[PDB]
RNA sequence: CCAGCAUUAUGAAAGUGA
RNA sequence: UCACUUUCAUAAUGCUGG
C-alpha cells in the first residue's frame, strides 16, 4: 500500500532529491522532490524517510489511485534441481552488532555439507557449492 | 551501520499441462 | 508461445533484535 513501495514498483531506480531542511533541530522539516514522466513533484515531511512517502503519494495520485558454480549458476538452484526438497539448517550465528558469521548445514541423504558466510543466504550457498563440487562433478 | 522474518515487482534455471 | 509449482539473484516496503 505504501507509496515508496508501489511507486518504486512502477519506477525502479528512481532518484529522490532533498531540496531543503527547515525548522529547529528537534522539529525539522524536510522537503524532497522527484521528476517522473516529465513532471517534478515536491512534498515535505517530518523526516527524510517520510518526506519521500509524502511525495510518492503525490505522484501516485497523478497516475491513478556473487558466488556461482561452473555451470554458471547459483548452487542453491542446482542443489534443488538434483535433490528437490533438501532442507538446510543454521548451525552457528555469531555476533550481533557488526561482523556476523552464519554456519549452515545441508546433508544429502547420506552426505552432509557445511558453509559459513556473512549473510545466511551466503553461508547457505557455500554449504551447497561444497556438497556439489565434492560429490557430483 | 549489521542481521532476521514477512509481503510486492523484475530476471534466470528445473518440472507439469495446453 | 500461455498457465501453474519449486529454487536462486536484484530492488523496494513494514516490523523486530543488535
Author numbering: 403 to 467, 519 to 590
Q: Could you pull the original sentences from the published paper?
A:
Nuclear factor 90 (NF90) is a double-stranded RNA (dsRNA) binding protein, conserved in vertebrates, which affects gene expression at transcriptional, post-transcriptional and translational levels (1–3). NF90 (and its brain- and testes-specific paralogue, spermatid perinuclear RNA binding protein, SPNR) consists of three structured domains followed by a C-terminal region that is predicted to be natively unstructured. Downstream of the DZF domain there is a nuclear localization signal (NLS) followed by a tandem pair of double stranded RNA binding domains (dsRBDs) separated by a 52 amino acid linker sequence that is predicted to be natively unstructured. To better understand the RNA recognition properties of NF90, we solved the crystal structure of the tandem dsRBDs of NF90 with a synthetic dsRNA.
To further characterize interactions between NF90 and the shorter 18mer dsRNA, we co-crystallized NF90dsRBDs with 18mer duplex RNA with 2′F ribose on one strand. Crystals of the NF90–RNA complex showed improved diffraction properties when a shorter construct of NF90dsRBDs lacking the NLS was used (NF90dsRBDsΔNLS). The crystals diffracted to 3.5 Å in space group P312. In the structure of NF90dsRBDsΔNLS in complex with 18mer RNA the two dsRBDs bind either side of the dsRNA. A slight deviation of the central axes of the dsRNA occurs between the two duplexes at this binding site, suggesting that dsRBD1 has a preference for flexible or intrinsically curved RNA structures. Each dsRBD has a classical α1–β1–β2–β3–α2 fold spanning two interfaces with the minor groove. The linker region connecting the two domains (residues 468–518) is not visible, consistent with the prediction that this region is natively disordered. A short β-hairpin bend formed by residues 519–527 extends the classical dsRBD fold at the N-terminus of dsRBD2. NF90 makes three base-specific interactions in the four minor groove interfaces contacted in the structure. In the NF90dsRBDsΔNLS–18mer RNA complex, 10 bases separate guanine and adenine bases at both recognition sites, i.e. the motif is G-X10-A and the bases emanate from different strands.
